[PDB]
């Protein structure tokens, strides 16, 4: 029963982040041997991070996950800002990066050594997005029966990196990796550029937090759910290291930083037939990363509307098929606004900064729930000095990423500071604007008439 | 909340809203086919990119002539086995060639006793030579052995014989290629009978054994008409001549001396060297020595350097040394004949740690020649400038363009470069961020203006500017 549960965690963690990251990890860490340390340090931190998220899932169990843990510890202001970011910043720019990966990898065989057009990527990524939200809204039984097709693509692609990698290991192709003396590069990057190599090394590990509260189906938790974390996530780190060793046995590290698509520059070498199946089996992997992130984008609009925030035009469910239309129309409008503007590799720094910032305040919530409110029934516990390693790693990464790229992190903190006026207009308002509150009723029923959607029964 | 009801909605919703729900459902699905055809048109209207040329190993990087093996490391450790210890040093220089001196036991003008198949016992044996080639193969450094037969006499190629010395070489082409040397050199082909038809027989066996081999030939002819007569029969021959060994201190001379060589050969692959077996410290002073290393590493072709070129090893400085083969300055005790005669900057140990030295200019130019696509096989388009200075642009299809402005004068002259004499595909913008300069005192990485470019005497500076629209 445990072996069935281990596949649930490794299936949703491993997506299309192994195809984007190793160009940006190598660019910011400099050397090849320092980049393989980053994939090891990040995988250990995720094991520490997914441990302290499992303790809140058995202590204060509620639907919503990350949003409801902050809701218990100063949950008025801080709980809304957890969901204000995950609606505008986290969930749109996680789909726009995977959508821009799809256009960048289908336009590597065409245009192999030149640059693809600047508006041929903003229009081919908006085609993967606008098609998938049409598929997603529709009869959701269709949207899950197509997701095991895209899951077979990322299993065919990541196998081909491994088996063609291990063939080059039993040869004379172990020059750059195995020698352990080829570890020198541009050292004018400080420690503060190694901090940006952790913003992009954990994009490949992302998606672990909202999984562990879903594994509920698990048999006898309180000992297993943990026993499941110690098996699944180091098996991701084994794959992510072995698929990054196989990237450097095929090409030069300077050759790896020139291509826009790392997985198919591997494919144009090492066989002649893999030029056809390296774009296909990875463009399938980026279809599942957007389709699998439009399921979980609507589960957070449900939990936000029933708690006071996020007015009730959202979280409505269509009458014939159990699909939320206006929750999908807010992660499709706001994703196109983030898509047309900026570069993909500086968009990962825009997510990974603010994604760590609320990674910390829930682990800080795990320690202040031990100072305040003790003797609560906890089936499993960790060391008291165990989550303070995560807070040590969070503090030394956040202030160094602010020093390195202050403009991409200054706009990440500017939208959180936009949260405190819209929150104080949100729930702390006197209901005396009669002329303004019926605008919300008029906004709802027109959206309830041109779209036939209805609130659920409960 | 804000709900209506499930049942109250369906008696109120869609009497005529069903018309707007069908019509807006087709407006999405029609604009998505307009976004699909509008994204295929952009791909076709995006032009192409150029196919990369078939680059051999000597196309990408520089060669490194090693004349005297006993003077390269010193007379105490002078052997072929002692050469193996210095392979880690040359890999830091990122050279790709190892054109070492001839080692085939010459007997000082006796044609019957100089067998090219047998190595001189003063250098080693057969067994340490292949393990030298096996050691250099792991670091990807290619070893080129030269077969000039009379290399210790006053005249090479044995002037009393015309045919036996020629078939002595031709038998040794299929002997050393069995051991796997990656090329051959023949110096002094100006002293040959029927020279231009004997290279064509030797480039047969060099290319016919394997396509990734090469032949180099060295003259001392500095005239343009003599060189082209050697390259009118053969085409894939690197000919390192003495063609640039004149002054060129006026700027318009070397512009008219370099762009005449590519124009007469039709922009083929040449080799840029000031001589065949002589250092850069000859033929030019020590203030123009950093100006020519920027020139030789950025011209289209394989730059060929001698040993002791990266540190500026002058043979005329230290007394009591042969002019053709000076001792390489490794440490402070590398020249033990005169105590207290070398400096700290006149040593490869002191040149290495100085970030503004001459070896720091060689190593910072050798990687950019070896790794950058616009310097490997980028096009060369020199253009006009002020009274005396040299300026040219290295550019490729979409890659990072390069722009070198070399000042050969002695006055602090303003550049005044005009972009009117360029093609439209490779024109220059107003700003271009600096990369390196010969004498320091400028902010590297700072985008300066290209119209107000005031330049110091003996100051060549390397700028780059990205592909734009
Ligand atoms: C395409 C143009 C460029 C991109 C612009 C953004 C486009 C976003 C489109 C996102 C995807 C839309 C998919 C719609 C089809 C869903 C498929 C389905 O299952 O249908 C079920 C369902 C089927 O209905 P039935 O056929 O009656 O059973 O579809 C609907 O009931 C309605 C479908 C149309 C939805 C109308 C959306 C109107 C948006 C207009 C916004 C105007 C301004 C609003 C201002 C608000 C201020 C706060
Ligand atoms: C586009 C997608 C269409 C389908 C979905 C429709 C969604 C419509 C609302 C979208 C925004 C949803 C989040 C609203 C804020 C959440 C915070 C909260 O707790 O609200 C509770 C609050 C009370 O909800 P109740 O508990 O359901 O009554 O909801 C609102 O007050 C919604 C207010 C709508 C406006 C939001 C802020 C707009 C900022 C821009 C203001 C522009 C000023 C005018 C500029 C010139 C205009 C010409
Ligand atoms: C070697 O070079 C010669 C030219 O110098 C090439 O042509 C041969 O020339 C000789 C006379 O010198 C003829 O006897 C041969 O029949 C020619 N070969 C032909 C026509 O194929 C010769 O091709 C070169 N060798 C190789 C292998 O290309
Ligand atoms: C190349 O070096 C030789 C050696 O000094 C120069 O002189 C020639 O020497 C040979 C043999 O000693 C004579 O047969 C020639 O007549 C000499 N040349 C002249 C012009 O007298 C030779 O001049 C050098 N080549 C150049 C282009 O300077
Ligand atoms: C050098 O290049 C130029 C053009 O790129 C050519 O020189 C021409 O040579 C002929 C010969 O009489 C003159 O009539 C022309 O006026 C020259 N052109 C110019 C623009 O001046 C030629 O391709 C090369 N020069 C030589 C001598 O081959
Ligand atoms: C190494 O640095 C020394 C500085 O001490 C240079 O020595 C000077 O050289 C110039 C001529 O090049 C003389 O006019 C000075 O009198 C020298 N100064 C001293 C203190 O001796 C030396 O030239 C440098 N080495 C090289 C190869 O340029
Ligand atoms: N969205 C996640 C990262 C992520 C989402 N889907 C993925 C698939 C594969 C790898 C990483 C991811 C974050 O913000 O951290």
Author numbering:
A (entry chain B): 41 to 498
B (entry chain A): 163 to 631
Task: Please give the exact wording used by the authors of the publication that reports this structure.
The l-type amino acid transporters (LATs) mediate neutral amino acids and thyroid hormones across membrane. LAT1 or LAT2 are the light chains of the heterodimeric amino acid transporters (HATs), which are composed of a light chain and a heavy chain. LAT2, which is mainly expressed in kidney and small intestine, has a broader substrate range than LAT1, including small amino acids. Here, we report the cryo-EM structures of the human LAT2–4F2hc complex bound with substrate Leu or Trp at resolution of 2.9 or 3.4 Å, respectively.
The cryo-EM structures of the LAT2–4F2hc complex incubated with Leu or Trp were determined at 2.9 and 3.4 Å resolution, respectively. The cryo EM maps of LAT2–4F2hc + Leu and LAT2–4F2hc + Trp are very similar to each other. The overall structure of LAT2–4F2hc revealed an inward-open conformation, with Leu or Trp substrate binding to the bottom of the inner pocket of LAT2. Interestingly, the Trp substrate shows a triangular star-shaped density in the map, into which we assigned two binding positions for Trp. In position 1, Trp exhibits similar binding mode to Leu, while in position 2, the α-amino and α-carboxylate group of Trp mainly interact with the TM3 and TM10 in LAT2, forming hydrogen bonds with Asn134 in TM3 and Asn395 in TM10, respectively. To validate the binding modes, we introduced the N134Q, F243A, and N395Q mutants in LAT2 and set up the counterflow assay. Results showed that the F243A mutation had almost no transport activity. The N134Q and N395Q mutations remained ~20% transport activity compared with wild type (WT) in the [14C]-Trp and Leu counterflow assay, or remained ~15% and ~40% transport activity in the [3H]-Leu and Leu counterflow assay, respectively, suggesting their important roles in the transport cycle of LAT2. We propose that the Asn134-binding and Asn395-binding state might represent an intermediate state of substrate recognition and transport during an alternating assess cycle. Actually, the corresponding residues for Asn134 and Asn395 in LAT2 are Ser and Asn in LAT1 and ASC1, which are capable to form hydrogen bonds with substrates, suggesting the putative dual-binding-mode described here might also exist in LAT1 and ASC1.
